[PDB]
Design a protein around this nucleic acid. Structure first.
Ligand SMILES: [Mg+2]
Ligand SMILES: [Mg+2]
Ligand SMILES: [Mg+2]
Ligand SMILES: [Mg+2]
Ligand SMILES: [Mg+2]
Ligand SMILES: [Mg+2]
Ligand SMILES: [Mg+2]
Ligand SMILES: [Mg+2]
Ligand SMILES: [Mg+2]
Ligand SMILES: [Mg+2]
Ligand SMILES: [Mg+2]
Ligand SMILES: [Mg+2]
Ligand SMILES: [Mg+2]
Ligand SMILES: [Mg+2]
Ligand SMILES: [Mg+2]
Ligand SMILES: [Mg+2]
Ligand SMILES: [Mg+2]
Ligand SMILES: [Mg+2]
Ligand SMILES: [Mg+2]
Ligand SMILES: [Mg+2]
Ligand SMILES: [Mg+2]
Ligand SMILES: [Mg+2]
Ligand SMILES: [Mg+2]
Lengths: 207, 257, 153
RNA sequence: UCUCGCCCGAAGCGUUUACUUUGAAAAAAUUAGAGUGUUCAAAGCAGGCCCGAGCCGCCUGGAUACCGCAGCUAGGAAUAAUGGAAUAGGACCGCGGUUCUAUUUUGUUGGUUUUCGGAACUGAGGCCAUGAUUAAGAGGGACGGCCGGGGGCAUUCGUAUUG
RNA sequence: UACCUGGUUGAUCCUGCCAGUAGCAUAUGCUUGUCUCAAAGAUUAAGCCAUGCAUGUCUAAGUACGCACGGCCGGUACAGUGAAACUGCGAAUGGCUCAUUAAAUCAGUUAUGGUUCCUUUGGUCGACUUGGAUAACUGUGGUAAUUCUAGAGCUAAUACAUGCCGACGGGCGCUGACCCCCUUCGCGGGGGGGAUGCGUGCAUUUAUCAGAUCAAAACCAACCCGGGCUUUGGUGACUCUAGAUAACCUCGGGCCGAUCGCACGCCCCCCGUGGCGGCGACGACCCAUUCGAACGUCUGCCCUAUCAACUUUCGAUGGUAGUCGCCGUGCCUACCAUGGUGACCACGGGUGACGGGGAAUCAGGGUUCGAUUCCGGAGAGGGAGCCUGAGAAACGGCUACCACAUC
RNA sequence: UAAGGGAAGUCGGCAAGCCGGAUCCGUAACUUCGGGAUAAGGAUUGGCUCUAAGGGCUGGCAGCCGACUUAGAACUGGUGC
């Protein structure tokens, strides 16, 4: 029965704002979307004006955008670290608008592998999974197409992002709201704010 | 309160309907439509007061729904329809045909026109936009969402629209020299010649006009409606060139009669 | 820079600059905006490394509505100040006047440096920025007088 | 300024108001007031005329006004406030240059080095009658020969009075 | 009507007050022939209420196998008047009352570029019929009770659902087997046409990019010719609208028609078993227009200092990240700073304060009322809570407590 | 220790019994302005699993190693601390 209204506040002074409403209809506040990382279970909530609103209760997917190479993929959510507004929802694994999320690295390997090949994340296995890059042999100008892709740009991603792909992880940031639109959509942390939130997580996991 | 109001008192009605108190408590509140409550006139005032056909407000419910009085060539059957400035009434079999202007004293004047103004009609653009798949749409204040219009219709212009096709022609554009007529505010009904705009960046425009005999006035573009290009209206025009005389000259208009 | 949990406006940072191998300078790709109605954006906004959510030059908060004045009396509040505005209210019966003042709050864009206490400012209207802050800094008229002085230490 | 198409638009695009007059802007109702023989009058927004039906009838009326204060625009620059240039870091004109980058032509496309506009900055001269309203029968102050049972500190003195 | 008379003394003159004086609006008394408009349980009790009422609803057009009525009557079923019912709107308007509340409602003002909107007005609207239930009905019933309600068999849909036929693929999105030459001793190096395969559109929601005013060159690597070649709209302001790129799209599944009335007519044939389509009703994807609503800005308020400092832990002012909500905000929550208002009367009281538009009084200027038809706010005994709906914290809606209170 | 009642017992609440430690709250009459005052009246208190804050020695803004306290949150027990 929470009301987000501004008639039970105080004035610029501090004198008690005497009431003349009775907490009307159009000033509700509903209880929150304590969002979890379970299987998909989305409640819907009727709005003023009849519109539809999608409570995110438990979610395991999310559509995120690899911003640099301009890729965007459906992806699994693994782990939730550093909410940056409360240091307590990191425990609860709760998703809000700006909450930094560990993401599994599968749908971003295979885009970059099949476009900018001799791929990443194999630790020099030296006997490990020879999967159809060593068989195609690229007789045509498609090899010479991909030669510009390969070393003229030279496509060096941000240094440490190799190590996330060594590990099967990817550190990203949400930009949508979970409980209001029913999605958890965001973008992948790159470069400067990659190394920013890295030292935040390291020192908070350190001490 | 709660939800929309749906009555209108006789005292609280707009004065430019000429409504009278001691006839009854209530006034005919129009429907929602192309004209707001201060830029409108119902059918029930137009037929029962001015043309004076019917005397009860339930017979007008019959003859608006006997499918004879139509607007623009399609049949409108409300008893409280919002007919406003610059609208066309047709009556299909029994031939009468109407154009709506303002009387210069502030009233809505009767003005009886022929079939060569069934063929066209003027209207003022309210906004321009682009719509889905890159095409232009253009929203006219007569609630006309009309598309693929033209390239050179600015936002504050006037369009000579046909009713049958629903397709524009002869798009006159706002520029100094024109003939214009004020549709709201403190100089309503006056017909004049466009003289000076001032584009303030304070969310408005403001307009000085001269008129026919040169005399100056001032109001805003939204209130204003363009009627022609250079002292010739595209419309026929009632009682002179739309002229407020003087208070005393209006008396001596009645004496020399 | 930033001394918070994070700040960064709208601009796509990580442009993958490197294809031959160079650092150069890096802080170039910046957002920028005019405010119209005859007020010039300062160059403090352009070589300003700070990031603001509520600035009229830097942020999304456009200026509709009104124009008013004030004098900057207290600056003891984060990123916002408290103007004061005297005027001459009129009384009908006595046929005379009386001074009044009504203290307003206004969000101080920190592009305006050296805005020191007592100088005349001009404000513009915005959305509800906070409980009391509905106004926004638009032009700083006075540089608090002495643009020449030197003193002891 | 004629960057835009000898005069005009437009463009560089202004230290503010206060006050004053216009101009907008307002809801009627009520009030002042018009008009009308509601039988006069308080009312009300009514009616007036011709056609012996005979024209698938004419004309006008349902105005005008004051709408405090406040906000807006355009005219007025008296009085009353407030501002610049005093360590000149000024008004104005022509120059040295650092380095920033801007699209058009080099058939195209790219490359390198520029003429090149502006933002930034830097160096120097001249240029301006180069800059400070006068000293209130206003006021603060300095000054110097007096004057005062002014004030405080200290001592000297007097008759009395009582013992 | 720009207006005074009596009253202190033995007498005057004078500050003075009391008394007359004229309205006005409630009462009260004496009285009253007619006629025109005509206020009227506001002041004390927003104290309690017996009683009958005040919200109902059908077009040729959602549903007729009713036991009602009879159309001309044969079976190719469905012609008409259709009680009652489901369904779609509507009861959130109009009415009443002034108890609340003192920058609060409101009033003059500006804006949503920071939002939602039933209706009305236009745009877009690229398997010859699938399915269970369901009322109405029939009975058979229950306790004194209410506008209570159970089960057994059938029946309709614009109640509810499930779900495809049209289609020529346009060309981009990007993979990709292949194909034509110069050079050549061969590898190699240098340019050009194209089978396979997944995407497709609008809305939801993410991320990026292009998102423009300029007037001249030396060649260096090629090479289109005869020295020489291509460009959305708006504001004053965009993170505007529109494009292009990558993908989701929530089984509590954005739309992308399994509807109805009125008449007919055209067609070429292998029957017509195929086609060929005029007018209106209905309701949905969003964009708008209107009726709105809301939160906003500037200025404005009655007496009180025997109310002078008040406010923050449980936000008091501000900063950032977020929840929420229709969106903007301490609106809440987290973290962090230490602020905000005051003699220009804040804060704390009083009010016989609903605010205005207005009314009375008539020189001028004021003074006192304004619950009272018009606009706006509030509340239905008190005070809390929510279903349905575009709209309610509804009360001639519902639940619970308290106070009354009937059977 | 004692169901129910709670000074009715007695000369008298004698003796017993309540209240106690702590943190956050909140505090009058009265006054020699020092007080009263730990006034009265309250709320919490366990267990475990964590976060937040308080440091020290070397450097050309980093790295090694250190004391036991203070607030916050979850979960759990037969409302028990
Ligand atoms: Mg750690
Ligand atoms: Mg001497
Ligand atoms: Mg008396
Ligand atoms: Mg008296
Ligand atoms: Mg009652
Ligand atoms: Mg009402
Ligand atoms: Mg009251
Ligand atoms: Mg509200
Ligand atoms: Mg409102
Ligand atoms: Mg807090
Ligand atoms: Mg008077
Ligand atoms: Mg007066
Ligand atoms: Mg009302
Ligand atoms: Mg209510
Ligand atoms: Mg009701
Ligand atoms: Mg016992
Ligand atoms: Mg016991
Ligand atoms: Mg006891
Ligand atoms: Mg006792
Ligand atoms: Mg005794
Ligand atoms: Mg004892
Ligand atoms: Mg015990
Ligand atoms: Mg004691």
């Amino acid at each position: 029965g929470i009301s987000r209204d501004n008639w039970h506040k105080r004035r610029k002074t501090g004198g008690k704002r005497k009431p003349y409403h009775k907490k009307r209809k159009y000033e509700l506040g509903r209880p929150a979307a304590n969002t979890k990382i379970g299987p998909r279970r989305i409640h819907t909530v009727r709005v003023r004006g009849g519109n539809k609103k999608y409570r995110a209760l438990r979610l395991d997917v999310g559509n995120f955008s690899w911003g640099s190479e301009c890729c965007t993929r459906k992806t699994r959510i693994i782990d939730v670290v550093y909410n940056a507004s409360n240091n307590e929802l990191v425990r609860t694994k709760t998703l809000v608008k700006n909450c930094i999320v560990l993401i599994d690295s599968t749908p971003y390997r295979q885009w970059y592998e099949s476009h900018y090949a001799l791929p990443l994340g194999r630790k020099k296995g030296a006997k490990l999974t020879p999967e159809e890059e060593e068989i195609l042999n690229k007789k045509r100008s498609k090899k010479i197409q991909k030669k510009y892709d390969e070393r003229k740009k030279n496509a060096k991603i941000s240094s440490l992002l190799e190590e996330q792909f060594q590990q099967g992880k990817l550190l990203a940031c949400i930009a949508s709201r979970p409980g209001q639109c029913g999605r958890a959509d965001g973008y992948v942390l790159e470069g400067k704010e990659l190394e920013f939130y890295l030292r935040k997580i390291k020192a908070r996991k350190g001490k | 309160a709660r939800g929309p109001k749906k009555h209108l008192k006789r005292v609280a009605a707009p004065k430019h309907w000429m409504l009278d108190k001691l006839t009854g408590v209530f006034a005919p509140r129009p429907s929602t439509g192309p004209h707001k409550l201060r830029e409108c006139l119902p059918l029930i005032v137009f037929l029962r007061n001015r043309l004076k056909y019917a005397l009860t407000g339930d017979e007008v419910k019959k003859i608006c729904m006997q499918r004879f009085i139509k607007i623009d060539g399609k049949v409108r059957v409300d008893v409280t329809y919002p007919a406003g400035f610059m609208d066309v009434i047709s009556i299909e079999k029994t031939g009468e045909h109407f154009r709506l202007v303002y009387d210069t004293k502030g009233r809505f004047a009767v003005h009886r026109i022929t079939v060569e103004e069934a063929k066209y009609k003027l209207c003022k653009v309210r906004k321009i936009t682009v719509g889905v798949k890159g095409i232009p749409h253009l929203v006219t204040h007569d609630a006309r969402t009309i598309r693929y219009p033209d390239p050179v219709i600015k936002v504050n212009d006037t369009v000579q629209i046909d009713l049958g096709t629903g397709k524009i022609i002869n798009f006159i554009k706002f520029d100094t020299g024109n003939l214009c007529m004020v549709i709201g505010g403190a100089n309503l009904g006056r017909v004049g010649v466009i003289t000076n705009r001032e584009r303030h960046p304070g969310s408005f425009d403001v307009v000085h006009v001269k008129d026919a005999n040169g005399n100056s006035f001032a109001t805003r573009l939204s209130n204003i409606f363009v009627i022609g290009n250079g002292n010739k209206p595209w419309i026929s025009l009632p009682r002179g060139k739309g002229i407020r005389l003087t208070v005393a000259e209006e008396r001596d208009k009645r004496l020399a009669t | 820079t930033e001394r918070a949990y994070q700040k960064q406006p709208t601009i796509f940072q990580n442009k993958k600059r490197v294809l031959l191998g160079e650092t150069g300078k890096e802080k170039l790709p910046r957002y920028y905006k005019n405010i119209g109605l005859g007020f010039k954006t300062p160059k403090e906004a352009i070589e300003g490394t700070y990031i603001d959510k509520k600035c009229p030059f830097t942020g999304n908060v456009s200026i509709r509505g009104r124009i008013l004045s004030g004098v900057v009396t207290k600056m003891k509040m984060q990123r916002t100040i408290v103007i004061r505005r005297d005027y001459l209210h009129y009384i009908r019966k006595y046929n005379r006047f009386e001074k009044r003042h009504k203290n307003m709050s206004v969000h101080l864009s920190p592009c305006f440096r050296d805005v020191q206490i007592g100088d005349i400012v001009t404000v513009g209207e915005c959305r509800p920025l906070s409980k009391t802050v509905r106004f926004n800094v638009l032009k700083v008229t006075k540089a608090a007088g002495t643009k020449k002085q030197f003193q002891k230490f």
